[PDB]
Amino acid sequence: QYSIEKLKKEENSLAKDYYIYRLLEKNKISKKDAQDLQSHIFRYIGKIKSELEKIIPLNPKYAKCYTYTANTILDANLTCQSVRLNSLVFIASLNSKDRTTLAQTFKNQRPDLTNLLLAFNTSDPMSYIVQKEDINGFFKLYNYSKKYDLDLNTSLVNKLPNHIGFKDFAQNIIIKKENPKFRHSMLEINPENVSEDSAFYLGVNALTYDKTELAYDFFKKAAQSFKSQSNKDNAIFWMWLIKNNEEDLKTLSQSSSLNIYSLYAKELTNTPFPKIESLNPSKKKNNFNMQDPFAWQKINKQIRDANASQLDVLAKEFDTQETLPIYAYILERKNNFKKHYFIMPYYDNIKDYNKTRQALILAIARQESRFIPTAISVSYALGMMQFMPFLANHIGEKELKIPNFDQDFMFKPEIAYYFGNYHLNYLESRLKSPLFVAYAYNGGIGFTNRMLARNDMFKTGKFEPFLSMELVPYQESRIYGKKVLANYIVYRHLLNDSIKISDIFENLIQ
């Protein structure tokens, strides 16, 4: 470990945060050591904040305004009332006499506040706001209570997409399968009124009610408006699944984006496999330390700051086997993510696993870390396979009994791949398909089991398994699974062990 004073020398980074956090969680930082530690934390969110505030606890314009309570709010001036009435919890806490008075007071200057004040006099504030078609109020109330749910007319639902909250509202209720009356109402949104992710989710919604022509119209709108080729491909795939137009399949097979949809279309049209870059430096190693987390943070900052000529210079400093992940990382930026980099670094460590397992390990590592051995996430997951300290210590200390085990052993590629394999043996025994294994690797076996036990997920159906892949209940896991699955297909191909993509999808249907 590093002493608190040595850490304070280091530049501020997620690595420095992580080591500060290691000392805090062991109670190794004294009260004076802890004093200026606020300024030595790169990202002062989550576990590290909570832990520092056990030692060091934390706008004068409005200090006066928080002296007032529900009982004294009418004594406050207009500015203080305004500030306090930003909270719906606070509005709900008032009595109806005072809400009625405040409603009259704010009628001209804050009419949206008036609507909410009056809404909270009724037993269903959402019904009141819906009657008004007060869109700002609608989203405030949804954020206040996710339980409100009622039928919304065509006029109202077609106004909802003109609010920045709509996208995540729509996504959340669709993938969580909540607010049935809201979901059903959104069938009357005109595709003309939505674009990108909103249009896409409304497509998925329409598919869950078996409105296939409506779904096509939403997916087509998404395909025309998405800015990223990867999302375009996902929308075009749905246009093809619904109407079977050959030109959509062909456009999809010709995509510059390497993803499961474009790969699947290439298979279906006998289009060749995409070109994968082949990187194999002659030099085995240099003086750069790939196990030093601070050195990576420093060189990452320099790479992220660099122009074309500077990236070319940096590439030549890292053209070695041992530094291949940094080299590939530099080159991925130098070609603006246009070429396809699927490296297989520290391969001697996995060569004795069978090729299917190698492909899965590589697929997960590429997604988790791009193979950077000292990768540290915002939750302090570590190394190429991004093990959380809890799991790393459980495997290293309890189950495997490794002498002198520290969780920083995760920065060693030999350990990362070994623990990766170990954890994959456990997941794959229960879950079978590499897609389901990916979901559990990212989101835990618990949520993955609860999901697969549902009678509406990954069962036989017209648009399965593709519909279920859009309804994974966590946005992060949905995306993760698709990316890892694409990576898995590519690594199977690179290992002269190609898999038929159609086979993979057929196996998802339980």
Residue numbers in the entry: 19 to 76, 81 to 532
Copy text verbatim from the article accompanying this structure deposition.
The structures from both crystal forms are very similar with a root-mean-square-deviation (RMSD) for 509 Cα atoms of 0.75 Å. At the N-terminus is a small helical domain (NU-domain) connected via a flexible linker to the helical U-domain. This flexible linker (residues 75–83) is partially resolved in the P3121 crystal form and fully resolved in the I23 crystal form; it spans 22Å between ordered anchor points I74 and Y84 in the NU-domain and U-domain, respectively. The central pore of the ‘doughnut’ is elliptical and has an inner diameter ranging from 16 to 37Å. The outer ring surface of these ring-shaped proteins shows a more random distribution of positive, negative, and neutral residues. This ensemble of positive charges on the inside of the ring of Cj0843 explains why the majority of sulfate and acetate ions, that co-crystallized at 200mM concentration in both crystal forms, were observed along the inner ring of the doughnut-shaped Cj0843 protein.
We report here structure-function studies of soluble periplasmic LT of Campylobacter jejuni. The LT Cj0843 was identified from a virulent strain of C. jejuni and localized in the periplasm. The LT enzymes cleave the PG MurNAc-GlcNAc glycosidic bond similar to lysozyme with the noted difference that LTs have an additional (2nd) cyclization step; this step requires a boat conformation of MurNAc leading to a 1,6-anhydromuramyl product as the predominant terminal saccharide moiety. The crystal structure of the soluble LT Cj0843 from C. jejuni revealed an unusual doughnut-shaped structure containing four domains: NU-, U-, L-, and C-domains.
